[PDB]
């Protein structure tokens, strides 16, 4: 299953909060704003995320202007946060951190 | 100059309205939602736009989820719509239309 | 299986030859050069192919300079042309044709 | 001018050799192979380079398969290595090093 147990969810939220993600209050979704130096960096980062979204069949809701990228993750068919969201968030952290 | 004359602005708005763009009421900006078949198409389109944004040093405000891309254009330093916005919009129409 | 039957291979080669691909003589691989108007188009095309490569876990050998993209497809683990190569080639044709 | 003085060329070659580039013997061009962990990384890197190529109007000759990217730089109109090649190489080093 892609569903999180209560234990897995608790742990995922701790880990994601440590990584700077927040939970939305009105949706079962997580959110984070990334700020790069420029658009070259931001769009290079988006390109990596896009590749992974297609590998996983799991897609972000995201906004960009120049160096800023705002990302909301949730599992659109399920209506809830799942292991797919946690995995994509962890990949996004890796893609962002390298620059 | 990148500034539009009154005549050039009037004509640009007519052309952009014909292309499905709208003017925002609260900002001097234009807006359009694009709907593709899938994310592969949407992100391929975004990649072309990103390339052009760097060629022009002129960047969109944009939101994507899966096949949908929402774009707002304005010239951030100027506070107004300029020839840069018109040129980028026309390029975006070309990139979208080819699929 | 991803392997082609003799019938499926014969048919795939006919279809791919009609689409402008050639068979290499020294490898069980197919090859085609694409020529676009510019790099914006060529790299937009590459971005779509890259997305699909990650969706499929199947990667091209490719060369680009400006508007030209040369692609060789074969299944690297198998040493032969497979259904993965045919599927990716058909996707590449779609991505190229739209511009 | 984009042309290198003899002093600037000597210094550029030293710096680029330190960065792992080589001079081709038969062309006035420089060459380097990059090896990433995977295609996600390699294509994210290519996307950054593509953006910069359009910003600069200066394009690589490059080959990719999975995690490997081979790049040859020269100024196609000039027939020689120029400041554009040095600048793009330095950008490529930055894009590669971050991962």
- Residues B83/B4, Cβ–Cβ less than 8 Å: yes
Give the span between the Cα atoms of B72 and B23, in whole angstroms: 9
Which residues sit directly before a break in chain C (C to N > 2.5 Å)? none
At the fourth CATH level, the homologous superfamily of domain A1-99 is Transcriptional coactivator/pterin dehydratase (3.30.1360.20)
Nearest to C60 by CA among A94, A67, D43, B12: D43
Judged by CB atoms closer than 8 Å, whether chains meet at A53 and B39 is answered as yes
Judged by CB atoms closer than 8 Å, whether chains meet at C51 and A50 is answered as yes
Interface of B with D (CB under 8 A): 47, 50-52, 54-55, 57
D-contacting chains (≥3 CB pairs under 8 Å): A, B, C
A51: its two tokens: 């590749």
Judged by CB atoms closer than 8 Å, whether chains meet at D63 and C66 is answered as no
CA distance B66 to chain A (A): 6
Judged by CB atoms closer than 8 Å, whether chains meet at B54 and A65 is answered as no
Interface of D with B (CB under 8 A): 47, 50-52, 54-55, 57
Q: Is D25 exposed, middle or buried (0-12, 13-18, 19+ CB in 10 A)?
A: exposed
Cα C59–chain centre separation: 9
CA distance A26 to chain C (A): 32
CA distance D32 to chain A (A): 21
Task: State how far the alpha carbon of B9 is from the alpha carbons of B15, B38, C93, in Å.
Answer: 10, 34, 40
Interface of A with D (CB under 8 A): 39-41, 43-45, 47-48, 51-52, 55, 95, 98-99
Give the span between the Cα atoms of C11 and C17, in whole angstroms: 10
Judged by CB atoms closer than 8 Å, whether chains meet at D45 and A43 is answered as no
Q: Helices C39-56 and A39-56 sit at what angle, rounded to 10 degrees?
A: 40
Task: Dump the DSSP string for A20-88.
Answer: T-EE-SSSS-EEEEEE-SSHHHHHHHHHHHHHHHHHHT---EEEEETTEEEEEE-BTTTTB--HHHHHH
| CA trace torsion B32, B73, D55, D32 (10° rounding) | -50
Enumerate residues 6+ apart whose C-beta is below 8 A from C50. Answer: A51, D39, D43
Residue in chain C lying closest to B42 (CA): C48
Nearest to C72 by CA among C10, C24, C18: C24
Greatest pairwise CA separation for chain B in angstroms = 39
| Residue A53 C-beta-side C-alpha neighbours within 13 Å | 26
Give the span between the Cα atoms of A60 and A47, in whole angstroms: 12
Neighboring chain B residues of C41 at a CB cutoff of 8 Å: 48
Nearest to D46 by CA among A88, A34, C39, A33: C39
User: Best of D40, D43, D48, D51 to disrupt the B interface by mutation (most B CBs within 10 Å)?
Assistant: D51
Experimental method: X-ray
DSSP one-letter code for D3? P
Task: Dump the DSSP string for chain C.
Answer: --PPPHHHHHHHHHHHHHTT-EE-SSSS-EEEEEE-SSHHHHHHHHHHHHHHHHHHT---EEEEETTEEEEEE-BTTTTB--HHHHHHHHHHHHHHHT-
Give the span between the Cα atoms of B77 and C65, in whole angstroms: 35
| CA trace torsion C33, C37, C41, C43 (10° rounding) | 50
> Which residue from D46, D61, D65 is facing C61, i.e. has the nearest CB?
D65
Judged by CB atoms closer than 8 Å, whether chains meet at B39 and A47 is answered as no
Could you tell me the sign of the dihedral formed by the alpha carbons of B55, B57, B58, B63, in that order?
positive
Nearest to C21 by CA among C81, C99, C98: C81
DSSP one-letter code for B75? B
Place of tokens 């909060």: A17
C57: its two tokens: 């876990």
How many other β-carbons are positioned within 10 Å of the β-carbon of residue A27?
Answer: 13
Task: Dump the DSSP string for D73-97.
Answer: E-BTTTTB--HHHHHHHHHHHHHHH
Query: A31-37: which pairs have CB atoms within 8 A and are 24 or more residues apart?
Result: A31/A70, A31/A71, A31/A72, A31/A73, A32/A70, A32/A71, A32/A89, A32/A92, A33/A68, A33/A69, A33/A70, A33/A71, A34/A68, A34/A69, A34/A70, A34/A71, A34/A96, A35/A67, A35/A68, A36/A67, A36/A68, A36/A69, A36/A99, A37/A67
Neighboring chain D residues of B52 at a CB cutoff of 8 Å: 54
Judged by CB atoms closer than 8 Å, whether chains meet at D50 and C66 is answered as no
Give the span between the Cα atoms of A82 and D43, in whole angstroms: 27
Task: Dump the DSSP string for D9-64.
Answer: HHHHHHHHHHTT-EE-SSSS-EEEEEE-SSHHHHHHHHHHHHHHHHHHT---EEEE
How many other β-carbons are positioned within 10 Å of the β-carbon of residue A59?
Answer: 22
Dihedral pair phi/psi, residue B61, rounded to 5°: -95, 120
């Amino acid at each position: 299953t892609h569903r999180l147990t209560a234990e897995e969810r608790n742990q995922a939220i701790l880990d994601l909060k440590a990584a700077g993600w927040s939970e939305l209050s009105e949706r079962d979704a997580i959110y984070k704003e990334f700020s790069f130096h420029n658009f070259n960096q931001a769009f290079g980062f988006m390109s990596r995320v896009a590749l992974q979204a297609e590998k996983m069949n799991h897609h972000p809701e995201w906004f960009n202007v120049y160096n800023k990228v705002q990302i909301t993750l949730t599992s659109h068919d399920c209506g809830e946060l799942t292991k797919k969201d946690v995995k994509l968030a962890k990949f996004i952290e890796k893609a962002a951190a390298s620059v």
